[PDB]
């Protein structure tokens, strides 16, 4: 029993973190096999970030200009290329701590763990959701660029995020491991619109199922609703519209608790319209949306 | 910017987790040097747990009855002893992944990360506070016994908790790594009173300082208070009394923000008496108490 915002064990990722320095700038790199991945803005100075021409800035750089250090050992850079907003530094040594890995571009609403790093050293691990607006609400200071997000299936690490930028609103933006930004963001010091964000409805419902499994059942009621009726309430409260695909994904949780998905929707509708009346659910006084149905099943069954 | 409930990187602890089996029961062990540590209830069957005589149950056991497996390798047990509520299994091989470590008995109100494990394999990592009543609100299922709590200073892991029991109320109890339970708990299947819990006042204030540092300042007011006036409010709302030692510990945060500790106390007093009026602080609709002043400094400065 109990339900916590749990991150994956970070060990396999800690063994991949390196420090990358280019001129005056130092940030984090991810060392997988014989390639070190890092944000391309490592080649910029403060005068460049306003509107950098990354192609021209990278032309003034040679393999010997990129300093890569893994703990105390210096890696030898034998190749360098830019792929979208990431730099790929070929080194002469494969990382002996390279786990089984994949690069994946996650969907908005999905979750992942972040290993925050500074100077190539890990400081902490936390669980994040990729917001429907493609930002993440993380915890990152200057020096954290290059820190990554990931999921773990058995022994395989699926890297899904690389931290690049803090927006003027304090929210975070970054790329997949091919260097493609999530959302409309660009890697330059300009005011950037993070669109309207919505609450991940299927995740709130998954968390309500976690609450029932763990004993928090005060919010269950004698009501039901329909997808169209529920979605009229979701639009009013800026919640993502619920689809039959979402209902299908909540099937295991509906089977486990014996509570039909539309009956849980009616509980959510009443919570949206009336609030919590000063009560809490799983230690929270607000509707939590950063747990997927998969996360709830995983945490409630004990998958390692 | 941003503030998250962050756990320490779990890597150094993952390399210590083993599976311990005694007869029918399997739980987690912590392998440090040539000793494997685990809850002593591994020697019990379901008939024993109601009122076990651990001394007599351990007498029916030999070194060969304790099966220890680290990943796929079997460890050879050459000694066994009981220390309070923990068993210490001497093995013939020192763990080559043993980090620099210490055993510490943490104080109530202090925080630590938990690496939840099943069959010797890690499933997730989360940050916990030792409640003033010596329970922890974690996330543990059957099989998680032997999972540990820890803090990390530079390269040294300070192990502070070993999970033993879920109380009928769904909260968690365990021991330090010498086998002494935190609180009045005993390792037997009996109804056990977890005393009245209070909110960790110094931690709520630390979190209010984190909120100001990160831009959430709506709760700041034109008022002040005194330790005695504030403590009249803390007693009414079952908050731990604030002492000058707590004020001293909040000194770095007071120096950084320029907000005197008693002025922050007056904000807390008004939040306690009026609620949040439907607003949030650092993404929360309730006063968060599981961040110490140290955690706030660490997260806000970037300690790795
Ligand atoms: C300070 C900080 C805090 C938290 N997360 C990231 C940063 N860094 C940044 O946002 C900036 C930057 C500015 C503009 C565009 C981009 Cl891609 C990056 N770097 C270059 C220092
Ligand atoms: C099921 C479970 C879920 C979460 N955390 C722990 C447990 N296990 C327990 O609480 C029990 C037990 C019962 C009584 C006393 C003690 Cl010390 C232990 N074990 C033996 C299964």
Please tell me about this protein's structure:
Two copies of one chain form a homodimer. Chain A is an alpha+beta fold. Chain A folds into three domains: 1-14 and 100-197, Trypsin-like serine proteases (Thrombin, subunit H), CATH 2.40.10.10; 15-99, Beta Barrel (Thrombin, subunit H); 198-301, Orthogonal Bundle (main proteinase (3clpro) structure, domain 3), CATH 1.10.1840. Chain A has helices at 11-14, 54-59, 201-213, 227-236, 244-249, 251-257, 261-274, 293-301, and strands spanning 17-22, 25-32, 35-39, 66-70, 73-75, 77-83, 86-91, 100-103, 111-118, 121-129, 148-153, 156-166, 172-175. In chain A, the strands form two sheets. In chain A, strands 5-4-1-2-3-7-6 form a seven-stranded antiparallel beta sheet, with no helix packed on it. In chain A, strands 8, 9, 10, 11, 12 and 13 form a six-stranded mixed beta sheet that branches. The first copy, chain A, is elongated and about 70 Å long. Chains A and B meet through strand 9, strand 10 and helix 8 of A and strand 9, strand 10 and helix 8 of B. The structure holds ligand KYC (2 copies). One ligand KYC binds at residues 41, 49, 140-142, 144-145, 164-166, 187-189 of chain B. The PDB classes it as viral protein. Keywords: Diamond Light Source, I04-1, COVID Moonshot, CMD, Mpro, fragment screening, PanDDA, XChemExplorer, viral protein. It forms a dimeric assembly.
């Amino acid at each position: 029993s109990g339900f916590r915002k749990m991150a994956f064990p970070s060990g396999k990722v800690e063994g991949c973190m390196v420090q990358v320095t280019c001129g005056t700038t130092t940030l984090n790199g991810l060392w997988l096999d014989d390639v070190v991945y890092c944000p391309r803005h490592v080649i910029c100075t403060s005068e460049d970030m306003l509107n950098p021409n990354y192609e021209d800035l990278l032309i003034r750089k040679s393999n010997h200009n990129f300093l890569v250090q893994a703990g105390n050992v210096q890696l030898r850079v034998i190749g360098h290329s830019m792929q979208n907003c990431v730099l790929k530094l070929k080194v002469d040594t494969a990382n002996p701590k390279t786990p089984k890995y994949k690069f994946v571009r996650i969907q908005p609403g999905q979750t992942f763990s972040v290993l925050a790093c500074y100077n190539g050293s890990p400081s902490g691990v936390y669980q994040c959701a990729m917001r429907p607006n493609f930002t993440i609400k993380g915890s990152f200071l200057n020096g954290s660029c290059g820190s990554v997000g990931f999921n773990i299936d058995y022994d395989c690490v699926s890297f899904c995020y690389m931290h690049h930028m803090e927006l003027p609103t304090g929210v975070h933006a970054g790329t997949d491991l091919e260097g493609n930004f999530y959302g409309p963001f660009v890697d330059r010091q300009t005011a950037q619109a993070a669109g309207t964000d919505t609450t991940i409805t299927v995740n709130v419902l998954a968390w309500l199922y976690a609450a029932v499994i763990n004993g928090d059942r005060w919010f269950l009621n004698r009501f039901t609703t329909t997808l169209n009726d529920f979605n009229l309430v979701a639009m009013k409260y800026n919640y993502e519209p619920l689809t039959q695909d979402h209902v299908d994904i909540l099937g295991p949780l509906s089977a486990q608790t014996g509570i039909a998905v539309l009956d849980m929707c009616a509980s959510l509708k009443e919570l949206l319209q009336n609030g919590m009346n000063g009560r809490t659910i799983l230690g929270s006084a607000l509707l939590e949306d950063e747990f997927t149905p998969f996360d709830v099943v995983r945490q409630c069954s004990g998958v390692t």
